[PDB]
């Protein structure tokens, strides 16, 4: 059992890319940028409740922030988390 | 450490001085001996790491006298 | 030509690590002398 506050606060944003579009159009899979304390059992529940869409498995990966320079000082971006949510056949969303 | 439970004596520092007044650091140690004292009140022996002066103090005052002082001080016997 | 520095993260953290400097009481003095100086990196732990 998972509360609703966690399901509402776990998701951060969707992800826009050519690979994400190809995955959505050829394998029924969406790409979501989520938080760090997230888990597969929580992402699946959040997608099933908020979006009312069935999910079978979730593939999550962590992204390493890049080190850039704004002028002379150096700065490392935040390490965000990416999740691949595969939708069951027959369900569509955007 | 080499400490008298009764009198509180601990090793001290001094100097070895020869016939030419050469001073070398040295330590003065107590004459500690582990002895078993017979306490009649609890009908059991007790082991105490004391010196000969502590033994004379025990012989002059008594064992129950010293054990009560140890309990007041917080020492374990 | 084998130089003196052959890196190893585990061996580096076992010796020059915060958990090791907490023990070996003279490591607390090392940490204090860096905190008073204002070091940005007290140890090499990442």
């Amino acid at each position: 059992m998972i509360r609703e506050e966690r399901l509402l606060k776990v998701l951060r944003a969707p992800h826009v890319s050519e690979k994400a579009s190809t995955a959505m159009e050829k394998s029924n899979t969406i790409v979501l940028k989520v938080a760090k304390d997230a888990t597969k059992a929580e992402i699946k529940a959040a997608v099933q409740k908020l979006f009312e869409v069935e999910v079978e498995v979730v593939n999550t990966l962590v992204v390493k922030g890049k080190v850039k320079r704004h002028g002379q000082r150096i700065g490392r971006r935040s390490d965000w988390k990416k999740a691949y949510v595969t939708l069951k056949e027959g369900q569509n969303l955007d | 450490s080499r400490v008298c439970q009764v009198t509180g004596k601990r090793p001290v520092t001094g100097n070895n001085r020869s016939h030419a007044l050469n001073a070398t650091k040295r330590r003065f140690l107590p004459n500690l001996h582990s002895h078993r004292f017979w306490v009649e009140s609890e009908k059991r022996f007790v082991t105490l790491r004391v010196s000969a002066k502590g033994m004379r103090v025990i012989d002059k005052k008594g064992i129950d006298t010293v054990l009560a002082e140890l309990r007041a001080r917080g020492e374990k016997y | 030509m084998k130089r003196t520095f052959q890196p190893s993260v585990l061996k580096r953290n076992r010796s020059h690590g915060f958990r090791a400097r907490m023990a070996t009481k003279n490591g607390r003095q090392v940490l204090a002398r860096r905190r008073a100086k204002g070091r940005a990196r007290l140890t090499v732990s990442k």
Binding site: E4, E5, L8, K9, L11, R12, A13, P14, V16, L50 | - | -
Partner: protein
């Protein structure tokens, strides 16, 4: 009073839930290039802070 101290704990919880839903919707809309008014995020976050503080006060 902010018209919320006179309410009940159940009403505050329901307001908490719908404010979180609105915050999630606004975040989803801001992630894509379609949201324009960004002050709503701060407003809803401060309202959530107010209601959560009132819950602790109760």
């Amino acid at each position: 009073a902010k018209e919320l101290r006179e309410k009940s704990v159940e009403e505050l919880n329901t307001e908490l839930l719908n404010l979180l839903r609105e915050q999630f919707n606004l975040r989803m809309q801001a992630a894509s290039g379609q949201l324009q008014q960004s002050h709503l995020l701060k407003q809803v976050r401060r309202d959530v802070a107010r209601v959560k503080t009132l819950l602790n006060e109760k």
